[PDB]
Design a binder for these strands. Structure first.
Ligand code: GFH
Ligand code: CL
Ligand code: CL
Ligand code: CL
Ligand code: MG
Ligand code: NA
Ligand code: NA
Ligand code: NA
Length: 326
DNA sequence: CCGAACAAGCATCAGC
DNA sequence: GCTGATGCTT
DNA sequence: TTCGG
């Protein structure tokens, strides 16, 4: 982390604009700049040097000059002093509490972890579970635990139906030594873009992982997206593992390669890649890549039989998962 | 100077 | 009930 | 907040 000081500052700024200002474009601006600086292979010596990077403009450049001279940013130090900003920012760290609910809670004087705990009746289901495991969800997952969780998920999915295919994606598939959560892509041959032959395809998997006490809680759940909580089982007299966020996405089997591209990320990589696709004349989502007309209407899906087909279409060299950690 | 800035599933609410 | 917009999250 | 045209 050559420029860890600068990238923390920018991330803290991005969080401020998102949670407090509700200014999504400033937030994306700071996050993109933090990501382009994180991969820049030199120790930045001036904001002018940084401004050579795309995504670093005038305003971020002078902020980087301030930080390099003084080690601090006055704007951030003030935001830290402000109670309402500190409280809104804190509350948004509970899963299911966003900037709107956080500001509304603060209006009602709900302002701290203890405030939340004494007001659970005021939370929806998701927020209640986010508060429940608030400490656990901020711990990272060593890759060695991701490997145990993977082995549980793939083996339980195998017992439901041998034709399911479960792929762990996210930072794990990018080779990260620790992950914030576990992301599981699910396919089954009965579910394609053309037909859904079996019902409750995701349900059955959720139910099987609940019954072996791997999945502990549910945050949200539909026919194709499960968001919930899991916990590794511990040995006799060992202390429990933390609970962990798990996301499961059932994708049409014929659309796996778009699905695994989407779910491997990163989120910023996805944004950068889908943006460039537009410039090249395509739109990419988790299902398809399609040409755009002159009007701006998506045409029919183009054929895809590997991740790299998608890169080819928009004329990018293939980048292995490991190199998509923007 | 001005428009664009990735794409979408689920929970929840308002309005009919 | 349904539709559509918003919040929140991936 | 930054970029491209
Ligand atoms: N197009 C688009 N895709 C998004 C977005 N947010 C998450 N994704 C994608 C890609 C992720 O890696 C993936 C999982 O979402 P994630 O929040 O688990 O991200 P991640 O890459 O796994 C993190 F590094 P970690 O989980 O380890 O803290 O889903 C988004 O805003 N737009
Ligand atoms: Cl904005
Ligand atoms: Cl600072
Ligand atoms: Cl599509
Ligand atoms: Mg993840
Ligand atoms: Na720049
Ligand atoms: Na939150
Ligand atoms: Na996730």
């Amino acid at each position: 982390t050559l420029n860890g000081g600068i990238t923390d500052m920018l991330t803290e700024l991005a969080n401020f604009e998102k949670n407090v200002s509700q200014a999504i474009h400033k937030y994306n601006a700071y996050r993109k700049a933090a990501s382009v600086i994180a991969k820049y292979p030199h120790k930045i010596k001036s904001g002018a040097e940084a401004k050579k990077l795309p995504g670093v403009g005038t305003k971020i450049a002078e902020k980087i000059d301030e930080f390099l001279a003084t080690g601090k940013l006055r704007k951030l130090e003030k935001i830290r002093q402000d109670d309402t900003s500190s409280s809104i920012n804190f509350l948004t760290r509970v899963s299911g509490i966003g900037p709107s609910a956080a500001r509304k809670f603060v209006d009602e004087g709900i302002k701290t972890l203890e405030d939340l705990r004494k007001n659970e009746d005021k939370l929806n289901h998701h927020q209640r579970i986010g508060l429940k495991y608030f400490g656990d969800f901020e711990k990272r997952i060593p890759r060695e635990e991701m490997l145990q969780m993977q082995d549980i998920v793939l083996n339980e999915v195998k017992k439901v139906d041998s034709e399911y295919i479960a792929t762990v994606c996210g930072s794990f598939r990018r080779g990260a030594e620790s992950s914030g959560d576990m992301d599981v892509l699910l396919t089954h041959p009965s579910f394609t873009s053309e037909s859904t032959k079996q019902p409750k395809l995701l349900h059955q998997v959720v139910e099987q992982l609940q019954k072996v006490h791997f999945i502990t809680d549910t945050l949200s759940k539909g026919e194709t997206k499960f968001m919930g909580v899991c916990q590794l089982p511990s040995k006799n007299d060992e202390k429990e593992y933390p609970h962990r966020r798990i996301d499961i996405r059932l994708i049409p089997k014929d659309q796996y390669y778009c699905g695994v591209l989407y779910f491997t990320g990163s989120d910023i990589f996805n944004k950068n890649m889908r943006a460039h696709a537009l410039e090249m004349g395509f739109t990419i989502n988790e299902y398809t890549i399609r040409p755009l007309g002159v009007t701006g209407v998506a045409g029919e899906p183009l054929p895809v039989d590997s991740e790299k087909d998608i890169f080819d279409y928009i004329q990018w060299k293939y980048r292995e998962p490991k190199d998509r950690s923007e």
